[PDB]
Design a protein around this ligand. Structure first.
Ligand SMILES: [Mg+2]
Ligand SMILES: [Mg+2]
Ligand SMILES: [Mg+2]
Ligand SMILES: [Mg+2]
Ligand SMILES: [Mg+2]
Ligand SMILES: [Mg+2]
Ligand SMILES: [Mg+2]
Ligand SMILES: [Mg+2]
Ligand SMILES: [Zn+2]
Lengths: 65, 83, 116, 66, 177
RNA sequence: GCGGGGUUGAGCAGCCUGGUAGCUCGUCGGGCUGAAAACCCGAAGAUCGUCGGUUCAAAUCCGGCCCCCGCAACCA
RNA sequence: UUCUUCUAA
RNA sequence: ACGACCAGGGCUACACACGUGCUACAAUGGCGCAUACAAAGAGAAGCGACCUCGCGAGAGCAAGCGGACCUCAUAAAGUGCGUCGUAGUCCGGAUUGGAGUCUGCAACUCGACUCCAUGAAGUCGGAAUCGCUAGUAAUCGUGGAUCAGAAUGCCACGGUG
RNA sequence: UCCUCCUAAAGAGUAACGGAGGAGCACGAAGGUUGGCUAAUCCUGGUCGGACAUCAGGAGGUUAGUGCAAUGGCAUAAGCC
């Protein structure tokens, strides 16, 4: 699951939530009642802007006819 | 509702402050934990705060509030909406 | 065949046909015919007019169709404007008398709006 | 007015519940006995009563005495 | 001509006094009464209008001219010229005889009666009103009719101002307030 | 440069010479199950790429228009 | 006649 | 202080979903009058007759009773007669307004009940699914426990069957 | 191929692979005559009625209408019954 979080100070609060997150619990998919140790993972990556619609300039070119 | 033969109910420590706030002559908010007290005609016009489990919300008392108790103007469940 | 603003039908028995007025039920229509002297199981057809012309005054003793709706809508707007708990019940659409709102409030809430 | 298209217009008697005897030119035909009219309506009597504002402090000093 | 007899003797001298007219011809007089049932739900067939036009002819004794659509609107699903409503202009005699039966019988028999308005004189003296149910007339038996018709009475007079048409209907004791 | 199309969450009919929004997949909620599939039941969902205009009225008719599927850009 | 699966203490 | 004390609140919230129930969707039924038959319980700070007041919930006086005596207690379904005659109805009772009573320092949140007015959905319910083998299922009443008050729950009890 | 304006230079005509649009009909009444008739849009009021049906009132002065394109016309109406 990938969510965009629009808000103020989003990455300032959640940048320390990366990496693994481990449960030790009795699962809901366990019939024997034994306790399993599972893990998840969270990526918190800051929303950079767009790359940029490329603006070419005919001074950084060399045209061969 | 209460029986007619008992009359309306009000708390003494409020009734000791209704009598005080009449004779004092002020528009001061008096904060009150008695939600269960019937409003009297000498209480009209007083901004008073009824407790609602968390805070004290000031209530202006009008003419048409006499038969009603104080707690009807201080909501306790701060519900907003599911969506 | 027409009392106090509405048209009472002509085939029913006496108190039963009277209850079509917004303001009388089975008990008050027994009290309307208690002062009009009419038996409560005669039809509205084959009556006498002087019975009926006094019968309209008995209904006019009380509060009825246009007036009873005007007082009730005034007493609702009395609660709507006080900002009391019951007025907040009426204008959210929730049940007033203190019922279960976790389940079975279908009369004040109507048909179900599914979660989208 | 043409002789065929316009319906029947027979002057009748308009009786009432309060004793109003009036003679209208009408298209009913049969005898007319009314219910309310301009004579005895609760407009000049009871429109002031049927508002029913009601007193709140005035209701309060009924239900006890001190 | 009962109210027209009643107009020509008391009401004529009355409006000379309470407006101070120069001449006798300056008095506001009523010209016609229009009875309209614009029934836009008669697009299915003529029959719902054919049963309604016969109802309004029983209200006051004229066969009503079926009015048609002036232009076309597809927002109301009518082309130009659909039979859409019926009107009756009562002039001369039959105006007053309806104007007596309306002000005495059919108007006080209206349910939740709280009088008429004084704000409905269309800017220039011609008072208009509208009734909800056709069964306020004693022409209309409740068992015999089946659809709740309703019409709107339009009174057209020769009043220039707004108060002069008010004082004209106040001479006939018209139920305002 | 000439043709075909842009339609609920998705994919397509219906486009008809203009008055009337369909299906499938999916989604939601039940049922069966110990549970999950598959199945079964009951639901809903559209401003017809877009913008002007023509008629009473436009997904439609038209005109420009945005994306693309193509087709063709040749003889020396 | 048809009918699949049950991961890791 | 994750210990202790008091006030007010919450455990009663509400787009939704599920389970267990109650009352209905009526005529083998409703309503009105009359009339017939239970069982098993409970009762002292109590059950409370009788009588009066009140439309009623109740109130007042106040016996009798620590109970095979007295009291809650009237059983209801049924029966007999009468009307309603297939309708959103004299079905249904939600909801809502006013008015009360009772309990309790105290009924706003948040009590039950009564009166008057009001009269939603519902005309027997899809996929499916549950109980039951004889005094049973079905159906109608009664009481107790809990409790100042406050059951459509539970635990009991009999009638028809 | 036909139709209308512009190009077209105040008679007529006038070109281009110049700018723009339409037609391959319709109608037994949409024709003839006689007799009447005056629109569009906005405003104020009025039962369901709502920006918009239908009814009055006034402003308004062809902004409408013309079986269809555009142009020229049309109230003595060629418009509407
Ligand atoms: Mg459409
Ligand atoms: Mg599955
Ligand atoms: Mg030239
Ligand atoms: Mg020239
Ligand atoms: Mg022509
Ligand atoms: Mg001519
Ligand atoms: Mg209007
Ligand atoms: Mg011609
Ligand atoms: Zn009368």
């Amino acid at each position: 699951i990938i969510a965009k979080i629009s808000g103020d100070g989003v990455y300032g609060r959640l940048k320390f939530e990366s990496g693994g997150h481990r449960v030790q619990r009795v699962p809901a998919t366990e019939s024997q009642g034994r306790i399993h140790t599972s893990a998840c993972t969270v990526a918190v990556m800051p929303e950079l802007p767009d790359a940029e619609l490329p603006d070419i300039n005919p001074a950084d070119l060399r045209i061969d006819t | 509702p209460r029986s007619l033969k008992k009359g309306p109910f009000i708390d003494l420590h409020l009734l000791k402050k209704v009598e005080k706030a009449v004779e004092s002559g002020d528009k001061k908010p008096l904060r009150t934990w008695s939600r269960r007290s019937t409003i009297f005609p000498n209480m009209i016009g007083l901004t008073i705060a009824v407790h609602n489990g968390r805070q004290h919300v000031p209530v202006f008392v009008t003419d048409e509030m006499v038969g009603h108790k104080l707690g009807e103007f201080a909501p306790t469940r701060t519900y907003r909406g599911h969506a | 065949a027409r009392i106090a603003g509405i048209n009472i039908p002509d085939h029913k028995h006496a108190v039963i046909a009277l209850t079509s007025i917004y303001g009388v039920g089975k008990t008050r229509s027994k009290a309307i015919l208690a002062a009009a002297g009419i038996a409560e199981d005669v039809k509205i057809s084959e009556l006498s007019e002087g019975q009926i012309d006094t019968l309209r005054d008995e209904v006019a003793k009380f509060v009825v169709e246009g007036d009873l709706r005007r007082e009730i809508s005034m007493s609702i707007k009395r609660l709507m404007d006080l900002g009391c708990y019951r007025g907040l019940r009426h204008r959210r659409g929730l049940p007033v008398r203190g019922q279960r709102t976790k389940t079975n409030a279908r009369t004040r809430k109507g048909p179900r709006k599914p979660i989208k | 007015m043409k002789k065929d298209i316009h319906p029947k217009y027979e002057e009748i008697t308009a009786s009432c519940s309060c004793g109003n005897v009036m003679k209208i030119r009408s298209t009913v035909g049969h005898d007319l006995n009314l219910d309310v009219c301009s004579k005895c309506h609760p407009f000049f009597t009871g429109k002031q009563r049927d508002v029913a504002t009601g007193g709140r402090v005035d209701r309060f000093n009924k239900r006890f005495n001190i | 001509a009962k109210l027209h007899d009643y107009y020509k003797d008391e009401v004529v001298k009355k409006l000379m006094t309470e407006f101070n007219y120069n001449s006798v011809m300056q008095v506001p007089r009523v010209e016609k009464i229009t009875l309209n049932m614009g029934v836009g739900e008669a697009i299915a067939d003529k029959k719902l209008l054919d049963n309604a036009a016969a109802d309004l002819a029983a209200i006051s004794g004229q066969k009503p001219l079926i009015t048609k659509a002036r232009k076309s609107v597809a927002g109301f699903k009518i082309r130009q010229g659909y039979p859409i409503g019926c009107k009756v202009t009562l002039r001369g005699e039959r105006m007053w005889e309806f104007f007596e039966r309306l002000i005495t019988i059919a108007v006080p028999r209206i349910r939740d009666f709280r009088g008429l308005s004084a704000k409905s004189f269309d800017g220039r003296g011609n008072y208009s009103m509208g009734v909800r149910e056709q069964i306020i007339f004693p022409e209309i038996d409740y068992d015999k009719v089946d659809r709740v018709r309703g019409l709107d009475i339009t009174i057209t007079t020769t009043a220039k101002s707004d108060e002069e048409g008010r004082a004209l209907l106040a001479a006939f004791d018209f139920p305002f307030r």
